């Protein structure tokens, strides 16, 4: 019926998919890259992080209900009075593999299916039939590839579906990405449509892509962070005001030097003002995953990394028949994807609260003859596998989503493995090393096309400039967290403070708020082993000191969720 989209191969040992927990995670990752190629539901970083959080929460409770855990307990309980938080009982269901298949298939089905349930009122509607159809093939195909098979008649399978229904009804946010009613408010420091993509022409009818097109200005999920239900956070999280705003509107020396670093470190490859090296250029793209064709969003890459970590530090050698491994993975992925979801929530809530402008507009519209550059261009977020030019993500700058996602994901890995892989203070560098780690942005396969992407052909048969294959090894999760964060400074899409306080990451000079630069004028960073996220800042509306940028925010969301043992956010503190 539908011509299936030819997907490129994943750089991962085939062995990983013999484990059913990893297998379903993988299916969730395939839907992520496919939905970003076809323009289906749950696109964008915050909502694609939530889809994975939901999938793993459903998997967690189906598994641990059938194979009860020792310390922790299920996220939801069977004896809870509140029906919405009431986990179905097994009553004879004893097959964990089928329970997981059931929870996984039901959740993903609900998330990516054609919303024939009437309530498809533009919540995020403008998805073609082909998009739904392409995603349906991924789902149908997975049933057949699942290790050990799928038995829909099984009791255990039906129990899993029950679990999925509960989590879906409780956590689904259909209109989370609604833009309705939002319009930028220009002025210094304020977010507005980026100047290289001021408007995009989208078809009037998605089903008819070669017909009429209309003007469209995109503002990604302006109301999400404020209104959506949180997952496992036990409090609301806040960041210090960014330099130039509110209580910090007097941090002009910081702001000025930030403009300077932005130019030298994040400009286009060929500009005379760009001081970034070839290796730093590789660090910027490696961590991209900016919603591209065949690639998807950042949560996808972070999960690709955690899969490697999981298998590398597994307790038992058998990936296929080991409950010790199955429980370790079901647990890790739940903690990690839940932290990722909530990090997406709070980074987006802070992004739209401050509405801080991206560096491209900040540098072009600075207004001062000796500070700005009305013609500056950034290396930009890469439009991989398209013949489009780089772009600036369609949402405010402060704090960085990449830094926040990364601070949460990797701090969660660190807490989980402390004492197991090595020993460290929870706030100092770990020992979690990985190697042979390849990013799809730099794999010798993906590329920058010279003509529009052809969905009926494998990218290998499409002319374009092929991205160099770079194989990395990292020494710790502290390095991952740091590099993932500064990568955005090299792409030129984030200010230094969107990642973390400049003091904690840059080498100081005798001049306050001004940092060290080498011979060729490039910014020099602190050694990863020495980095400590301690600099706090003030807020105009609240008393106390608060973290600065995304990494410290992600770190705090992860510690809270872990310290509380993966427990639902009290309903009394969810948005009104």
UniProtKB/Swiss-Prot annotation:
Annotated compartments: Secreted
GO annotations of cellular component type: extracellular region
Keywords: Chloride, Metal-binding, Oxidoreductase, Peroxidase, Secreted, Vanadium
Entry EC number(s): 1.11.1.10
Post-translational modification: The N-terminus is blocked.
Domain of life: Eukaryota
Ligand binding (vanadate): 351, 358, 400-402, 488, 494
Record's catalysed reaction(s): RH + Cl(-) + H2O2 = RCl + 2 H2O
Entry cofactors: vanadate
Single Gene Ontology MF annotation: chloride peroxidase activity
Catalytic-site annotation from UniProt: 402
Subunit comment: Homotetramer.
Family: Belongs to the vanadium-dependent haloperoxidase family.
Function: Catalyzes the oxidation of chloride in the presence of hydrogen peroxide to hypochlorous acid (ClOH), which in turn can react with a nucleophilic acceptor (RH), to form a chlorinated compound.
Protein name: Vanadium chloroperoxidase
Taxonomic lineage of the native organism: Eukaryota, Fungi, Dikarya, Ascomycota, Pezizomycotina
Gene name per UniProt: CPO
